[PDB]
Amino acid sequence: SGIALSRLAQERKAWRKDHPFGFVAVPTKNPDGTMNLMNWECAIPGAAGTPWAGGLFKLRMLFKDDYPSSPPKCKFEPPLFHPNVYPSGTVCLSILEEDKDWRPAITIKQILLGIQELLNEPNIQDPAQAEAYTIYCQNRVEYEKRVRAQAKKFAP
């Protein structure tokens, strides 16, 4: 656990010094009240001028003991309508799979910015949920209408 905790302390220090505006990333607490660097509560703001604008989308970031060998599991809570988000809330993204594009050097900031980019540009070769994928393919106007409604629902 020393390797993960040392890296996670480095990430926290960097994040607090400089992070993208409107984003949140904060470790949680253990039952005894001490800091739990393995479980972070995060939020991603929708990009201005997009259907996601005005929404603030809460996500949990869960680190395994072998981090940064492995990527964190990133899970929208509550789950979101998006073609590449599983119904569970888990994000499907190549940088978040050890055997795909994860690299140990990737930072929490890079992950959250990567997920923000995913929100506004789905990967249609990578569908994780049937409904959002089907609507994206069949009617982009309806898709955006649904995204706008969701953004309003999660206005901060």
Ligand X SMILES: S=c1[nH]c2cc(Cl)ccc2o1
Residue 47 binds ligand X, judged by CB under 6 A:
no
Residue 144 binds ligand X, judged by CB under 6 A:
no
- Is residue 137 annotated as a catalytic residue, yes or no? no
Q: What is the DSSP secondary-structure string of 54-118?
A: T-EEEEEEE--TTTTSSPPEEEESS----TTB-TTSBB--GGG-TTTT--TT--HHHHHHHHHHH
Among 8, 38, 42, 80, binds ligand X (CB under 6 A): 42
Phi and psi torsions of 14, nearest 5°: -60, -45
Applying CB under 6 A, the span of 53-61, 64-72, 92-100, 111-119 interacting with ligand X comes to 53-61
Work out how close the CB of 135 gets to ligand X at its nearest, in angstroms, rounded to a whole number: 25
Residue numbers annotated as active site: 92
Q: Which residues bind ligand X (CB under 6 A)?
A: 41-43, 58-60, 77
